[PDB]
mmCIF file of C-alpha atoms in Angstrom:
data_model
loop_
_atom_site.group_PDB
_atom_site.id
_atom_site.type_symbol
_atom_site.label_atom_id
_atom_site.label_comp_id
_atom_site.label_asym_id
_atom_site.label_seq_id
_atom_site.Cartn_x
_atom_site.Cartn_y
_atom_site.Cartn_z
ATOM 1 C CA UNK A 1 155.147 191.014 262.435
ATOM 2 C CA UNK A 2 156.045 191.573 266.134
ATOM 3 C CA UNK A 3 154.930 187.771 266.553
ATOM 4 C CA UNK A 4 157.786 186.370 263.946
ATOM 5 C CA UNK A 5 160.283 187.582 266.767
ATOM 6 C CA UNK A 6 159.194 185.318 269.850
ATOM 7 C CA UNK A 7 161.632 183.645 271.601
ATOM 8 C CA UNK A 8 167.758 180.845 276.238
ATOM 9 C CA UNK A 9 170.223 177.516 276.253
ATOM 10 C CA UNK A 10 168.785 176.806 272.649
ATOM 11 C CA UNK A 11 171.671 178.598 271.667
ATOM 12 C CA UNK A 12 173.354 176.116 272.576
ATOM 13 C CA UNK A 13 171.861 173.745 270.551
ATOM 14 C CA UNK A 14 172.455 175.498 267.500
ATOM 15 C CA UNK A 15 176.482 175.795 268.882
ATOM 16 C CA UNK A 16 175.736 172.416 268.715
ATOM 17 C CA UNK A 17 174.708 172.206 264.792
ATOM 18 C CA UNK A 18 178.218 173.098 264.884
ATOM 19 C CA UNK A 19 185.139 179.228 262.964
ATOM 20 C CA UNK A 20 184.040 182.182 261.066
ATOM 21 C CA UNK A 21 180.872 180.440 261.245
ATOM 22 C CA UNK A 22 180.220 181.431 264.345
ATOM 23 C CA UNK A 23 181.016 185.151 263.209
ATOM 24 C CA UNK A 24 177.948 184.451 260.859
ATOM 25 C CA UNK A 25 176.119 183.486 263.482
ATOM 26 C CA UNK A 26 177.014 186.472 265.846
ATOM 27 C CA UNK A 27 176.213 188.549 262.213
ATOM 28 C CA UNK A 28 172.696 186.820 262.103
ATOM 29 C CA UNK A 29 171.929 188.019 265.372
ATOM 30 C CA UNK A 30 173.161 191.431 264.544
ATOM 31 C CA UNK A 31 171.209 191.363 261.420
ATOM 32 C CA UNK A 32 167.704 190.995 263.748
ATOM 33 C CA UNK A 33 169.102 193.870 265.577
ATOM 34 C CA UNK A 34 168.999 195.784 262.652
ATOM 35 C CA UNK A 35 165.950 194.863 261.087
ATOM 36 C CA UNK A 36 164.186 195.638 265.013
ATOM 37 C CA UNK A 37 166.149 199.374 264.867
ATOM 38 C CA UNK A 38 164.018 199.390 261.330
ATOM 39 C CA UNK A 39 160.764 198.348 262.996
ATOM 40 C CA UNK A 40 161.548 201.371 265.562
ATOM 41 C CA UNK A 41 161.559 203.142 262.848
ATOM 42 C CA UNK A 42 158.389 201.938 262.271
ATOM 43 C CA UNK A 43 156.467 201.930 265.251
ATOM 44 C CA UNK A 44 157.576 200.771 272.794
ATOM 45 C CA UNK A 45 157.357 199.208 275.702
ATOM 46 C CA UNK A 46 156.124 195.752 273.799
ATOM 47 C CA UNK A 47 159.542 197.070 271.457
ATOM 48 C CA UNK A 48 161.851 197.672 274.318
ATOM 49 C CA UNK A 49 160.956 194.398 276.073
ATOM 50 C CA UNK A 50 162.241 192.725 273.034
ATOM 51 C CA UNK A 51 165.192 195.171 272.547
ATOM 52 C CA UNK A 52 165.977 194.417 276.272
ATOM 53 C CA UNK A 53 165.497 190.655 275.028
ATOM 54 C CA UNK A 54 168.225 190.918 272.264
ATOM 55 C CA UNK A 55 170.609 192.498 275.205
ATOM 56 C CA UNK A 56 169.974 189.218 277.413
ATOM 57 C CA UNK A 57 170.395 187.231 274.243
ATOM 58 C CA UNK A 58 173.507 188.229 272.579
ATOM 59 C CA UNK A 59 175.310 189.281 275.719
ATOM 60 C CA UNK A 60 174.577 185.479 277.024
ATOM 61 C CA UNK A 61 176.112 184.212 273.513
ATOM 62 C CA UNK A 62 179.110 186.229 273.954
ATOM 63 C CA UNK A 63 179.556 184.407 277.409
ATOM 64 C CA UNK A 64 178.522 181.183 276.150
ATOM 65 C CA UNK A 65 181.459 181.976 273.551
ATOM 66 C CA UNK A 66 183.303 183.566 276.532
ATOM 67 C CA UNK A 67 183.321 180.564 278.405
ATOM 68 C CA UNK A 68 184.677 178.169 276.335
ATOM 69 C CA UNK A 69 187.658 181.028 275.596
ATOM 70 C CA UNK A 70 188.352 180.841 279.159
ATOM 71 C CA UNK A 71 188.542 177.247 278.929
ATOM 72 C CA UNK A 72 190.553 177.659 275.870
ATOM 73 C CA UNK A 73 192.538 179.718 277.991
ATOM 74 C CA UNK A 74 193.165 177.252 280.994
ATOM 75 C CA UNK A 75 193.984 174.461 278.826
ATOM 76 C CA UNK A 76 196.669 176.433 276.944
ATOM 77 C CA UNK A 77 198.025 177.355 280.394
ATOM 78 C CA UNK A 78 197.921 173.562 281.169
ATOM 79 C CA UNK A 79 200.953 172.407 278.263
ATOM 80 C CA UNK A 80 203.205 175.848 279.305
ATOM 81 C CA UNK A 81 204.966 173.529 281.698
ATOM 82 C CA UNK A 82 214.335 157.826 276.200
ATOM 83 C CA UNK A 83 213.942 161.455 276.940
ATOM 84 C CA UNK A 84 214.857 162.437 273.600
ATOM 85 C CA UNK A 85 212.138 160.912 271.661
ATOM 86 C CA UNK A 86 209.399 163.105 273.815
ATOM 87 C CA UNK A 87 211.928 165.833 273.041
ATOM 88 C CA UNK A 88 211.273 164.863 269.682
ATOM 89 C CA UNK A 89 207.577 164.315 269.639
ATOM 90 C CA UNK A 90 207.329 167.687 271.255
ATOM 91 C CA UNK A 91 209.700 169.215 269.011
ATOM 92 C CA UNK A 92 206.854 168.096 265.638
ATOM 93 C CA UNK A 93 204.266 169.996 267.297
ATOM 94 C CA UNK A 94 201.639 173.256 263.728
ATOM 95 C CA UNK A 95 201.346 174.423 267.681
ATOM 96 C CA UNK A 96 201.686 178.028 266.735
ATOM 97 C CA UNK A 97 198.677 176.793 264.557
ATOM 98 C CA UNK A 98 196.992 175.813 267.670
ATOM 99 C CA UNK A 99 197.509 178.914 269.469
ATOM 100 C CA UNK A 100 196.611 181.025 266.225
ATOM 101 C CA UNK A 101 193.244 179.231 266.381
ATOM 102 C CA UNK A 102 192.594 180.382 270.451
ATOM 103 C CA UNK A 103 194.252 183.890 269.239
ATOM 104 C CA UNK A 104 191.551 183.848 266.587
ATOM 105 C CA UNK A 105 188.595 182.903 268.620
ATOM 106 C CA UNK A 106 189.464 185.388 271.102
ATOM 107 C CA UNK A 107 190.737 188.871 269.926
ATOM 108 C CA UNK A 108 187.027 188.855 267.386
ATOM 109 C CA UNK A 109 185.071 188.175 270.020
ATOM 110 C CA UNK A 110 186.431 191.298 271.814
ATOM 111 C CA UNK A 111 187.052 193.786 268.979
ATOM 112 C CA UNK A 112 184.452 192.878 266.527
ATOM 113 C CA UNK A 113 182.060 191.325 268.675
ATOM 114 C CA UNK A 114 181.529 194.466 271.108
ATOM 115 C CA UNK A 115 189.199 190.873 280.933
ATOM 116 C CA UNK A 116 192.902 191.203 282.196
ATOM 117 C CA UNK A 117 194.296 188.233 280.551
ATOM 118 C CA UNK A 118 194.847 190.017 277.443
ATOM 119 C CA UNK A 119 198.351 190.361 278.478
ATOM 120 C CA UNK A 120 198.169 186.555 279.587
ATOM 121 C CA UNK A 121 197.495 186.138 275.617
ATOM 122 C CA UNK A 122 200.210 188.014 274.633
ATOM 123 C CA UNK A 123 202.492 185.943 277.232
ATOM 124 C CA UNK A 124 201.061 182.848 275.759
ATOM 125 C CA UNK A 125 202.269 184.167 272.455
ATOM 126 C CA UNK A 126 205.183 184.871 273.648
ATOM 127 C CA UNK A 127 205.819 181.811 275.703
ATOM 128 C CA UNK A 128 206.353 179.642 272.512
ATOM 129 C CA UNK A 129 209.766 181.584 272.300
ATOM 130 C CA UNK A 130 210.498 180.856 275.902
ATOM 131 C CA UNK A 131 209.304 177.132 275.164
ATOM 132 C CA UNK A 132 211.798 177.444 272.702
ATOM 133 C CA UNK A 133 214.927 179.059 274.812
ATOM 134 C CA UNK A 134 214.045 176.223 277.778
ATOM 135 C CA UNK A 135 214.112 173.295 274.863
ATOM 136 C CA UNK A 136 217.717 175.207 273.604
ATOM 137 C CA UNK A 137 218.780 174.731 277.319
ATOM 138 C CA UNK A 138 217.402 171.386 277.102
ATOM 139 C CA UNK A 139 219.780 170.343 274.029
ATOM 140 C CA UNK A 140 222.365 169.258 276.332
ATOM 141 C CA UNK B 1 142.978 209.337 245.415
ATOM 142 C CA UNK B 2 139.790 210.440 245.958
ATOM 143 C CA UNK B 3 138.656 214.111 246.911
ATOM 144 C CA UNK B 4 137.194 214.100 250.533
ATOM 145 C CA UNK B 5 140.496 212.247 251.566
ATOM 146 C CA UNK B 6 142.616 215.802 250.570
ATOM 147 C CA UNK B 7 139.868 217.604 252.581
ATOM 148 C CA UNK B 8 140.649 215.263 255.826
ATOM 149 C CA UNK B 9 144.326 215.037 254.860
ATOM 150 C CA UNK B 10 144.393 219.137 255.063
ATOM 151 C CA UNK B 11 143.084 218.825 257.760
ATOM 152 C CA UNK B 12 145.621 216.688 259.875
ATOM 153 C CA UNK B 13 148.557 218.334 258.594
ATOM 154 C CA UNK B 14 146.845 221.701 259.440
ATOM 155 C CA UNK B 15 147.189 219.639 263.070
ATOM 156 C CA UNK B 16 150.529 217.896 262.974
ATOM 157 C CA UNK B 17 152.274 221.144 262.014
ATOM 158 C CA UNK B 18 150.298 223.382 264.107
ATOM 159 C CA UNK B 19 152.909 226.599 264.647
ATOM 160 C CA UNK B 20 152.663 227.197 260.682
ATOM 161 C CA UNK B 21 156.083 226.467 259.358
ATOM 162 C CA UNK B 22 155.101 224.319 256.599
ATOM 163 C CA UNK B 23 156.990 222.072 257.394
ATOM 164 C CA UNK B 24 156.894 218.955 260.207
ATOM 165 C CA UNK B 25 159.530 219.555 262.129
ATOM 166 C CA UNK B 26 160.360 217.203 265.514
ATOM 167 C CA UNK B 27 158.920 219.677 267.870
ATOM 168 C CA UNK B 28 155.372 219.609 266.952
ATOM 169 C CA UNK B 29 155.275 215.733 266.151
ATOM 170 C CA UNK B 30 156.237 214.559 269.425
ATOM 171 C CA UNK B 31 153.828 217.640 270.902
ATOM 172 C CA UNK B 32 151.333 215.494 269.041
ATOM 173 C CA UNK B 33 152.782 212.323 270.330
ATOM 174 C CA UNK B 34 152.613 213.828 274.341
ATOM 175 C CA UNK B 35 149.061 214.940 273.501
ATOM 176 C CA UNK B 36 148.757 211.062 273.187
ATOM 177 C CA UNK B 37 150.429 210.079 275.642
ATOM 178 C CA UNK B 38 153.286 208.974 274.645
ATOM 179 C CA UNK B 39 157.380 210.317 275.159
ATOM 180 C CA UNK B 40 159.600 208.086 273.334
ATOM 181 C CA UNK B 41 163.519 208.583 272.631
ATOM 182 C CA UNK B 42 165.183 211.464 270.374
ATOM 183 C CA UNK B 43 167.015 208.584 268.517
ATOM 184 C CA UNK B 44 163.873 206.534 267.146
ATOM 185 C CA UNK B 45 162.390 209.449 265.923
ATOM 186 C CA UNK B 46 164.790 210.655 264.105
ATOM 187 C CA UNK B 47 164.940 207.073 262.393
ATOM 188 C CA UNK B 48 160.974 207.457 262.185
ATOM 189 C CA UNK B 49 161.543 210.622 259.930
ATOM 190 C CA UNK B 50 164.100 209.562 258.485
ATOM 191 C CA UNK B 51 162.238 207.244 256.870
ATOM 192 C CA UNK B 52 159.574 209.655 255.943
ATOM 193 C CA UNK B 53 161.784 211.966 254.812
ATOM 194 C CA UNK B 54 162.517 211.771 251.086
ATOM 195 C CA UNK B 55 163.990 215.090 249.934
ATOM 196 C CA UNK B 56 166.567 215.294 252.779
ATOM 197 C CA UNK B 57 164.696 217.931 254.725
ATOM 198 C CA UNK B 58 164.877 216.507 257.994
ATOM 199 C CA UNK B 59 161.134 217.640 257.892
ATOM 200 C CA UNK B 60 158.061 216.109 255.520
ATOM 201 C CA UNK B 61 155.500 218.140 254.423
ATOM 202 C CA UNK B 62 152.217 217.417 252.542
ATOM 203 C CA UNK B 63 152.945 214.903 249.518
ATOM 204 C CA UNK B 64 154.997 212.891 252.278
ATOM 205 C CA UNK B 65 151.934 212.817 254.128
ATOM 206 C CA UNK B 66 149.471 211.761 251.528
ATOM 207 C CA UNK B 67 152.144 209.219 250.472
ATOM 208 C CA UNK B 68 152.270 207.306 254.024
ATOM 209 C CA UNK B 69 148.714 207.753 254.284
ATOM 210 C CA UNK B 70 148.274 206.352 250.471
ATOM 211 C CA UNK B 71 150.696 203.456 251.057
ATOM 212 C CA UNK B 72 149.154 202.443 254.678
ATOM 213 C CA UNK B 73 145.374 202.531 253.231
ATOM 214 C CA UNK B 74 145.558 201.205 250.015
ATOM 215 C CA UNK B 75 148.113 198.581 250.443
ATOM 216 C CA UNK B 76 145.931 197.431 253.346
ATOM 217 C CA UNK B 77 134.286 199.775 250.389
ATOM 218 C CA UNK B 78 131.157 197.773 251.769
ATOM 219 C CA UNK B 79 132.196 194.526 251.473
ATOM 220 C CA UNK B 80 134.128 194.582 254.789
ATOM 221 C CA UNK B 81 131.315 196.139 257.112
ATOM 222 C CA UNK B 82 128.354 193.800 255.180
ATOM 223 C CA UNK B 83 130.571 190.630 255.377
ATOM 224 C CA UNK B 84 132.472 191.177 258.576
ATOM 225 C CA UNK B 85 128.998 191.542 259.904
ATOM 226 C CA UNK B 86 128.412 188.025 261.366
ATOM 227 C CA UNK B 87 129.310 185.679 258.321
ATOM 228 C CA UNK B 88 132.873 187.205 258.177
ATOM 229 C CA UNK B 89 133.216 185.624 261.757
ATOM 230 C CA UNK B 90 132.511 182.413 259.715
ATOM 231 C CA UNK B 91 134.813 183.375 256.865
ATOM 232 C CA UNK B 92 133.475 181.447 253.831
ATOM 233 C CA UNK B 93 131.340 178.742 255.213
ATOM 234 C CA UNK B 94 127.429 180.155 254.966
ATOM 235 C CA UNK B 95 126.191 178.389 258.141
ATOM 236 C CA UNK B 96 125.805 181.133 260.909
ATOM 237 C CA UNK B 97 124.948 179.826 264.475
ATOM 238 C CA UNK B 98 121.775 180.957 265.601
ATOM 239 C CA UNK B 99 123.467 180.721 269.148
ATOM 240 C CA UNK B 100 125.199 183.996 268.159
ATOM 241 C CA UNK B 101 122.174 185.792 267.167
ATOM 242 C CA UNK B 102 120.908 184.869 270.456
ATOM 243 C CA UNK B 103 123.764 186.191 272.167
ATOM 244 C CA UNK B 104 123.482 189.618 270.356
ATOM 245 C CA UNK B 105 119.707 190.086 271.270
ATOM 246 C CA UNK B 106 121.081 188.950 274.913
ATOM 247 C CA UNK B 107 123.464 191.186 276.063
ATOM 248 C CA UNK B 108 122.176 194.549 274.083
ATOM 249 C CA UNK B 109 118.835 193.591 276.826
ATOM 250 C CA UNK B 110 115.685 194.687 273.724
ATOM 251 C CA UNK B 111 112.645 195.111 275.158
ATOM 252 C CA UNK B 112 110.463 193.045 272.572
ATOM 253 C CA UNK B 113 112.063 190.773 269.887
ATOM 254 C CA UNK B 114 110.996 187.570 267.959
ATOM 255 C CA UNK B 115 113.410 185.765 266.051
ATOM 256 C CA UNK B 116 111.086 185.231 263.065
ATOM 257 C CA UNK B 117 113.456 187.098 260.603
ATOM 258 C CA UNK B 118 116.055 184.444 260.891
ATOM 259 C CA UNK B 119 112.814 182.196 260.000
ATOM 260 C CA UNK B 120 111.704 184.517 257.294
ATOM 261 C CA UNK B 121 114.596 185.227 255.054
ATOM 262 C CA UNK B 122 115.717 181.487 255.218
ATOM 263 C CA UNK B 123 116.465 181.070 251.351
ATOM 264 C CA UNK B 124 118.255 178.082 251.285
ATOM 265 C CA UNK B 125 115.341 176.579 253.391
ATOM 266 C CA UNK B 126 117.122 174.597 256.103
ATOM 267 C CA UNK B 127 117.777 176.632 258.610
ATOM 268 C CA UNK B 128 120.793 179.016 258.132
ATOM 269 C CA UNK B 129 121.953 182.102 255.586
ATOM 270 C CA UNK B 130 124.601 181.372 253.312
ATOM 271 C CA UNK B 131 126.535 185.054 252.119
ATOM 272 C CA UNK B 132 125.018 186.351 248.995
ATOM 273 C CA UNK B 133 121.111 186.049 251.120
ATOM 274 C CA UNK B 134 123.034 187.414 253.484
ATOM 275 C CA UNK B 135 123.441 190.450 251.727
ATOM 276 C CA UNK B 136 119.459 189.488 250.355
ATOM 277 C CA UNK B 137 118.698 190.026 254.027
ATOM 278 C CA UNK B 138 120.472 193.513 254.726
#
């Protein structure tokens, strides 16, 4: 019953199997943490190996989620910066939807699933109004 | 259960709770824990009785005790120690190796042996002991 637990980038195989999904999937993890606090209750050191196991392996998730939020991150910072048909085709983008999604990924990870750009975040929600002043400039 | 198993189960609990308070307290299970070796945290142990506890004491006493020592042997007579004996390292197959035998009267050094019982309570008649002669032979 100690042997059903043996087992790191095959995580990222099963990303690749692959939103709140992966909130399951944090929860599944979680839910063998739980069931190994019960088995404390049960039974050390072959039990703390393995608790220090499930602190490698959901602290390297949360970067392996962590690092495509950065990424997430950078490419948002990439779009902050016949003319009026790109005005136009700008003007469609559902981007707030985009940003909602990042906002989503991100915020979870920290609150539930427990750097300075916080505040970058809240600038990036924030810089769709700007977007929007600079395009009002650009109406002329 | 049975009526021996109270006399050894008085007897433990007479150890676990060895001030006299009647009840198991924390104190006294991890002195018997240290006598054993062994120091773990003051979190696991309180999930350890916690799920002993039933009544909400905080502390089990004697009918928790027979019940984790009822659940942990019964759940899991002389069949075991008879079978276990060298067909059980065969587990349901009746052809023991005579190489083991050998290997027994090898490393326990006897003075004087001769394998003639192997020859001598061969019932089968070929050359090996299926279970129940097994048990013929013991």
């Amino acid at each position: 019953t100690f042997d059903k637990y043996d087992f790191l980038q095959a995580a990222y195989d099963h990303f690749m199997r692959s939103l709140e999904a992966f909130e399951a999937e944090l929860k599944k993890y979680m839910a063998i943490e739980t069931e190994v606090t019960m088995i404390n209750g049960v039974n050390h050191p072959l039990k703390n190996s393995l608790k220090a196991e499930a602190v490698s392996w959901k602290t390297q998730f949360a970067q392996n989620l962590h690092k495509q939020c950065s990424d997430d991150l950078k490419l948002d910072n990439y779009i902050r910066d016949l003319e009026d048909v790109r005005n136009v085709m700008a003007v469609l983008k559902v981007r707030e939807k985009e940003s909602e999604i990042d906002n989503l990924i991100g915020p979870i990870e920290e609150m539930y699933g427990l750097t300075t750009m916080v505040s970058d975040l809240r600038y990036g929600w924030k810089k769709l109004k700007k977007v929007a002043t600079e395009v009002s400039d650009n109406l002329t | 259960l049975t009526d021996e198993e109270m006399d050894m189960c008085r007897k433990a609990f007479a150890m676990f709770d060895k001030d006299g308070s009647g009840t198991i307290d924390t104190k006294e299970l991890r002195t018997a824990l240290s006598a054993l070796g062994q120091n773990p945290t003051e979190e696991d142990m309180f999930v350890m009785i916690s799920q002993v506890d039933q009544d909400g004491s905080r502390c089990i006493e004697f009918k928790e005790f027979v019940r984790v020592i009822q659940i942990n042997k019964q759940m899991s007579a002389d069949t075991l120690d008879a079978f276990v004996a060298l067909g059980g390292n065969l587990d349901k197959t009746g052809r023991i190796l005579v190489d083991k035998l050998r290997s027994i009267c090898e490393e326990f050094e006897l003075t004087v042996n001769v394998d003639r019982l192997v020859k001598d309570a061969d019932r089968d008649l070929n050359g090996f002991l299926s279970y129940d002669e097994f048990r013929a032979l013991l």
